[PDB]
């Protein structure tokens, strides 16, 4: 698994791979690793599929309930702490989750919180979670600029996942893109890594060590 | 979680054209000690069902009590307890299956393997198995423990699939079962020569036979076997 999220001038980019494996068995090449909490909030899933899917969907329900109660959009800080505190109640039971809670509110602006099953909750600008994380970090760390264009930012995120999909045996299948704006997130497609790799290799000139 | 102490071995059964047959020896083992010999492991319930039990004997006795209570209870405020509202073999099984799975789910199982044999009110044959794990299944022939390995192959040579049921008579069927009981006495080190057998026929009803014995055994050829290879005398 490789998932990433980063903050920039245009909001937030969220990119994930779509592979599921149990040992050496590729269970699927088309899994969703992004949960649309609600029209304004996205969550990434790394670790346990069931744990992330279940609690991130439940988070959505808590967020909605908050908005009905307070007649106001929930903050990313508050949304992420609901998940964090829930997960913390289960500490030691065996939950397995590495996640990013992403939103863009008027009050906070673009915000990303890393939340895991250890009970860790970190606010940050860039995060990568999964067995492919180190690969994505290399690409992200050397090309990231706060002043990136929504177009370039989207490409950077897609490229970083591609890097990981290539080197990490547990990452691959396709890439799913998202752009988070204050008015909500925008889906930016599903890109099969198979086709994406060759295209990027040619157009970019990278992956020279691979015969094409 | 526990561990079986006094145990009963195989329970074999099969269905023929008009009913089902089920048998089980009368032994209650204690490890390698063949401790008790007057143990009845076939439990008749009413006159259309027989429950054969293998595994822990203390748990079997417990199941016995559960079964007697079912009968008592079913009779309560039931003017049709001996007619339209009498216990069906399928009700008895569903009940036991429920208990077995609940007990394994609480990590405190009834250490048994059970076969419920009987005839439904509409005449249909009923044969289904349930064990300590709550696992259940049906087949023209059913056997637990050792009998699963040695009896099923023999009984299946008679009824290999559904269509063979209507072609099988009580005589043929009872013969198979009796032969299987003898085989088990030859190769199962926890078996007994004495056993009980029960027939549940949609016409003749429930026939329960006690004190049967394995007969017609071949041992003479043993005199011809000496040494373990090169020895001549």
């Amino acid at each position: 698994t490789t998932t990433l999220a980063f903050r920039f001038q245009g909001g937030i980019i969220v990119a994930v791979d779509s592979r599921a494996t149990a040992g050496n068995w590729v269970a699927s090449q088309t899994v969703k690793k992004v949960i649309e909490i609600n029209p304004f909030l996205l969550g990434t899933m790394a670790g346990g599929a069931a744990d992330c899917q279940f609690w991130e969907t439940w988070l959505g329900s808590q967020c909605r309930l908050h908005e009905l109660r307070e007649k106001e959009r929930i903050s990313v800080a508050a949304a992420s702490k609901i998940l964090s505190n829930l997960v913390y109640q289960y500490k030691g039971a065996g939950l397995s989750m590495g996640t990013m809670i992403c939103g863009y509110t008027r009050k906070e602006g673009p915000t990303i919180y890393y939340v895991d099953s250890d009970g860790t909750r970190l606010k940050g600008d860039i995060f990568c979670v999964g067995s492919g994380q180190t690969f994505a970090y290399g690409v992200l760390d050397s090309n990231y600029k706060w002043d990136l264009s929504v177009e370039d930012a989207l490409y950077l995120g897609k490229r970083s996942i591609l890097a990981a999909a290539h080197r990490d045996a547990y990452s691959g299948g396709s890439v799913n893109l998202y752009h988070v704006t204050e008015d909500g997130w925008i889906y930016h497609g599903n890109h099969d890594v198979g086709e994406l790799f060759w295209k990027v290799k040619e157009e970019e000139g990278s992956f020279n060590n691979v015969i094409g | 979680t526990q561990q079986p102490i006094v145990t009963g071995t195989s329970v074999i059964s099969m269905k023929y054209d008009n009913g089902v047959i089920i048998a089980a020896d009368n032994l209650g083992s204690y490890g390698s000690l063949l401790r008790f010999n007057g143990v009845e492991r076939l439990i008749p319930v009413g006159d259309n069902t027989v429950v054969g039990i293998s595994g822990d004997i203390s748990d079997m006795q417990h199941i016995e009590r559960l079964l007697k209570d079912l009968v008592t209870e079913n009779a309560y405020d039931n003017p049709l307890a001996d007619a339209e509202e009498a216990l069906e073999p399928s009700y008895i099984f569903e009940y036991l299956a429920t208990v077995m799975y609940q007990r394994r789910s609480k990590m405190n199982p009834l250490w048994n393997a059970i076969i419920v044999a009987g005839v439904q009110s509409n005449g249909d044959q009923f044969l289904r198995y349930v064990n300590l794990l709550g696992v259940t299944y049906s087949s023209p022939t059913l056997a637990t423990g050792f009998g699963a390995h040695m009896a099923n192959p023999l009984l299946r040579k008679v009824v290999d699939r559904e269509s063979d049921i209507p072609k099988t008579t009580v005589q043929v069927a009872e013969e198979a079962i009796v032969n299987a009981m003898r085989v088990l006495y030859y190769r199962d080190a926890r078996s007994s020569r004495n056993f009980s057998l029960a027939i549940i026929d949609k016409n003749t009803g429930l026939t329960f036979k006690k004190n049967l014995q394995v007969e017609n055994m071949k041992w003479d050829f043993a005199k011809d076997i000496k040494g373990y290879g090169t020895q001549k005398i």
Binding site: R19, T21, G23, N24, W25, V26, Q29, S131, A165, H166, R167, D168, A169, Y170, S171, G172, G173, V193, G194, F197, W198, F207, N209, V210, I211, G212 | -
Partner: protein, 204 residues
């Protein structure tokens, strides 16, 4: 821990009309880390082909061993070794290490130069021989390969047809295995000639 799941890789051999094919992926990894996309698992001594899956260090060692043995064989016999004979050599060489085996899954493919008969065989890590008439699979995606072969395969396929079959079996099996892929090569073998083709596949 499991020596046969450290580096990854697969190999598959098939028989066809007066021909045989043997194929393999090109991956060499370190658990989840891909390391090389040019690690071929097919070798040949004269007209006999040997594919080896499993622990890479042993794949390399075994190849060097059999090159060494078939070279001496040729110098004494004054003829190149045949598929049938080589299979016996592979078998006894593996059993010789019965209690400290090479962690590999060899596969032999070739045509007997005198009878023209197509030949393929598989081995377990201690030499047990499997002489199949249809196909032989080996590697971290051998289950997937069995599924692919048992369906896609049919007798007496012509070289050009067997090529498509062997390739589709290899490729689709590899894409369901995290430790296989990163390229693939297929060998089409006939009495007179042998063609080697590199396939295009996903690189993730």
């Amino acid at each position: 821990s499991d020596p046969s799941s450290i580096n990854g890789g697969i190999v598959v051999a098939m028989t066809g009309k007066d021909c045989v094919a043997i194929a393999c992926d090109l991956r060499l990894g370190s658990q989840s880390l891909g390391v090389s996309n040019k690690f071929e698992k097919i070798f040949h001594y004269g007209h006999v082909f040997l594919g080896i899956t499993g622990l890479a260090t042993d794949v390399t060692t075994l190849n060097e061993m059999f090159r060494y043995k078939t070279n001496l064989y040729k110098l004494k016999e004054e003829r190149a070794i045949e598929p049938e004979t080589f299979t016996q050599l592979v078998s006894s060489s593996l059993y010789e290490r019965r209690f400290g085996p090479y962690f590999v899954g060899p596969v032999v493919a070739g045509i007997n130069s005198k009878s023209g008969k197509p030949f393929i065989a598989g081995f377990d890590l201690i030499g047990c021989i499997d002489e199949a008439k249809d196909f032989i699979v080996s590697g971290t995606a051998s289950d997937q390969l069995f599924g692919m072969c048992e369906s896609l395969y049919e007798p007496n396929l012509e070289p050009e047809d067997l090529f498509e079959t062997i390739s589709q079996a290899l490729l689709n099996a590899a894409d369901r295995d995290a430790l296989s892929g990163w390229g693939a090569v297929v060998y089409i073998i006939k009495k007179d000639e042998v063609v080697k083709r590199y396939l295009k596949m996903r690189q993730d």
